[PDB]
Amino acid sequence: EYPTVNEIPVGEVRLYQIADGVWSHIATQSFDGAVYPSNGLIVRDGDELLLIDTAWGAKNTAALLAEIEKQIGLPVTRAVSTHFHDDRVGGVDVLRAAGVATYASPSTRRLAEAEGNEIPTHSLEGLSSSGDAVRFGPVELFYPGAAHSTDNLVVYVPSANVLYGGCAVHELSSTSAGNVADADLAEWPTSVERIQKHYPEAEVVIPGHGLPGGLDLLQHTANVVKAHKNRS
Numbered sequence: 001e002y003p004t005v006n007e008i009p010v011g012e013v014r015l016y017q018i019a020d021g022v023w024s025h026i027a028t029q030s031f032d033g034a035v036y037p038s039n040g041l042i043v044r045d046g047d048e049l050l051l052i053d054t055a056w057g058a059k060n061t062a063a064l065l066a067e068i069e070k071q072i073g074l075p076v077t078r079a080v081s082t083h084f085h086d087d088r089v090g091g092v093d094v095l096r097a098a099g100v101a102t103y104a105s106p107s108t109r110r111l112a113e114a115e116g117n118e119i120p121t122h123s124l125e126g127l128s129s130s131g132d133a134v135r136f137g138p139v140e141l142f143y144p145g146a147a148h149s150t151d152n153l154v155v156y157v158p159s160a161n162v163l164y165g166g167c168a169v170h171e172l173s174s175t176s177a178g179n180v181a182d183a184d185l186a187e188w189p190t191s192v193e194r195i196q197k198h199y200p201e202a203e204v205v206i207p208g209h210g211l212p213g214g215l216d217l218l219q220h221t222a223n224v225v226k227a228h229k230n231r232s
């Protein structure tokens with residue numbers, strides 16, 4: 001069973017095998033008095049590991065690195081943050097101090113700076129226009145356009161057909177668009193449509209919070225966001 005917010009204490013981390021050489025990591029964190037789950041990705045890259053997104057905080061991310069070393073035993077050499085919020089860059093100082101080279105789009109780094117969040121060390125060029133993609137180790141990085149945030153990236157693992165949508169993508173049981181404070185609601189459905197068109201062979205889709213599912217999460221996300229728009 002995929003771990004839920006109830007079976008993970010704030011401070012601990014779970015790994016969940018998605019495919020050969022692909023894992024999700026799940027942590028929990030207390031935000032505005034309530035506890036929420038949060039996903040990231042781990043992708044094997046030969047004898048090294050690529051980390052996608054922190055575990056939402058310094059303490060969680062340290063637990064993440066110890067859990068990875070224990071369970072997988074390969075060094076995390078690089079990490080990518082998929083947008084500027086604290087569930088994606090919270091813990092980047094820990095990663096950096098531990099010798100992990102941390103990456104994000106220039107957009108993410110600028111937004112995190114202005115937000116007072118931790119800032120990834122290196123910039124990812126080539127992701128400024130909607131529809132842009134670059135290769136980064138064993139994955140592709142895709143900027144679908146503004147959605148949950150104006151900078152959000154999605155990550156595809158072509159060898160495993162795994163799409164990590166991050167907070168641009170919602171889990172199937174969710175009916176709310178979640179945190180839309182920094183969202184471009186006008187563009188979010190279109191940005192989702194780009195993901196559908198660019199990665200139609202994705203077999204697993206992982207949201208930024210909640211249970212992974214199939215390709216259905218993408219359309220479901222567009223519906224949730226458009227329902228939110230209409231309600232307003």
Ligand SMILES: C[C@@H]1[C@H]([C@H](C(=O)O)[C@H](C)O)N=C(C(=O)O)[C@H]1S[C@@H]1CN[C@H](C(=O)N(C)C)C1
Nearest residue numbers: 031036037085086087167171174178179209210
């Ligand atoms: C509290 C979080 C986290 C923080 C937030 O909302 O600000 C983050 C630090 O920005 N981001 C968030 C988001 O909407 O992306 C929310 S989680 C959201 C609430 N219900 C949804 C859900 O399906 N859950 C499994 C809990 C997702």
Ligand SMILES: [Zn+2]
Nearest residue numbers: 083085148167
């Ligand atoms: Zn966010």
Ligand SMILES: [Zn+2]
Nearest residue numbers: 122123124125
């Ligand atoms: Zn660079």
Ligand SMILES: [Zn+2]
Nearest residue numbers: 085087167208
């Ligand atoms: Zn989030």
